[PDB]
Amino acid sequence: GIQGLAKLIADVAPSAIRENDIKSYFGRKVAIDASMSIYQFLIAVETTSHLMGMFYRTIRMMENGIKPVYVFDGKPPQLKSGELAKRSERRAEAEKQLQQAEVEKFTKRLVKVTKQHNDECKHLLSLMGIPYLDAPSEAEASCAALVKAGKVYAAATEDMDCLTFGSPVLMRHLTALPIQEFHLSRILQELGLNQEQFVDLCILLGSDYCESIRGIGPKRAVDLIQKHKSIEEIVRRLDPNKYPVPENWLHKEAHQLFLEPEVLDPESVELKWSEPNEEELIKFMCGEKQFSEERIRSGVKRLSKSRQ
Numbered sequence: 001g002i003q004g005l006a007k008l009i010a011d012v013a014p015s016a017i018r019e020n021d022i023k024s025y026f027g028r029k030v031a032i033d034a035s036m037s038i039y040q041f042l043i044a045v046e047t048t049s050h051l052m053g054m055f056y057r058t059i060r061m062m063e064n065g066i067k068p069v070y071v072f073d074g075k076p077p078q079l080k081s082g083e084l085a086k087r088s089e090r091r092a093e094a095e096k097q098l099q100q101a102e103v104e105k106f107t108k109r110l111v112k113v114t115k116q117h118n119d120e121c122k123h124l125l126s127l128m129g130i131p132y133l134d135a136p137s138e139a140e141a142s143c144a145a146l147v148k149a150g151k152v153y154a155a156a157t158e159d160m161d162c163l164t165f166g167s168p169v170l171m172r173h174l175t176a177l178p179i180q181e182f183h184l185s186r187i188l189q190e191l192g193l194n195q196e197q198f199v200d201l202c203i204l205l206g207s208d209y210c211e212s213i214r215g216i217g218p219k220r221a222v223d224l225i226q227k228h229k230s231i232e233e234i235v236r237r238l239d240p241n242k243y244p245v246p247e248n249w250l251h252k253e254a255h256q257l258f259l260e261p262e263v264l265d266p267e268s269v270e271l272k273w274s275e276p277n278e279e280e281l282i283k284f285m286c287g288e289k290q291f292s293e294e295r296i297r298s299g300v301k302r303l304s305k306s307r308q
């Protein structure tokens with residue numbers, strides 16, 4: 001995510017954020033960041049919470065006429081050609097910050113979406129008749145591309161860096177309370193920045209891909225981006241003794257990653273929603289995952305009715 005982005009937009013561009021009832025979305029298609037959704041199900045208060053949340057939160061969407069397409073993460077982006085970055089390195093950064101102390105905040109970040117979580121959620125979605133795509137890299141980047149192409153109305157994720165990846169519309173809290181909807185065009189207009197400049201502001205705010213300048217906070221960053229437009233222009237004017245830039249700063253590699261990310265082909269995708277398979281759903285959820293037969297049978301019934 002982008003450190004303090006949702007709070008900064010609430011201060012500078014409040015009219016880009018709108019809170020709406022889930023009843024206002026009947027008939028809409030959304031691209032859900034499945035990796036972040038599974039993560040959110042695992043951290044809420046062996047485990048089957050990933051399947052429980054996937055089954056009941058998807059049935060709720062279908063009961064409110066929302067048609068979801070789940071997008072799963074592929075390989076992590078590589079910023080340098082010499083090194084091999086792994087998503088577990090971010091969880092290692094979260095473990096250092098945890099033992100220092102916001103204690104609960106860093107405890108959530110340790111949680112891994114395992115191989116078994118992804119495969120069992122894709123198995124559940126197939127039985128339910130819900131389509132899913134595998135993104136070549138970040139699912140939030142592919143959710144944004146599906147929106148730009150007009151394939152779906154919005155990207156549904158808790159990840160603010162979906163705006164950084166260019167998603168025109170971002171819906172938050174769909175798998176949780178009203179839906180929080182962000183409009184990128186309105187954000188860019190109120191800040192007086194184009195997408196390239198917004199990506200550099202997000203870098204200075206704090207992203208998962210590189211460091212941000214120590215000493216330059218959120219208000220100072222907006223100002224410096226409004227005046228100088230780029231990070232290369234800001235660094236060439238900062239006092240190197242007052243504000244030293246990070247050593248071996250990957251800000252250029254992070255910028256390219258956000259502007260031209262590796263995304264799925266939206267035209268290769270032919271979205272279909274099909275009838276749930278009740279017999280195979282009971283055998284998997286109850287027979288294999290020890291779920292209550294009556295609670296599953298009831299959910300499948302609500303889901304079948306939602307289509308017809």
Ligand SMILES: CN1CCn2c(Cc3ccccc3)nc(=O)c(O)c2C1=O
Nearest residue numbers: 001035036039090091094109113159208
């Ligand atoms: C599958 N997950 C796991 C959680 N997650 C987070 C949350 C986080 C932040 C920093 C280190 C670890 C996890 N931020 C993202 O930016 C992000 O993309 C994800 C994600 O997709």
Ligand SMILES: [Mg+2]
Nearest residue numbers: 001140159161
């Ligand atoms: Mg992210």
Ligand SMILES: [Mg+2]
Nearest residue numbers: 036139140159
């Ligand atoms: Mg993600």
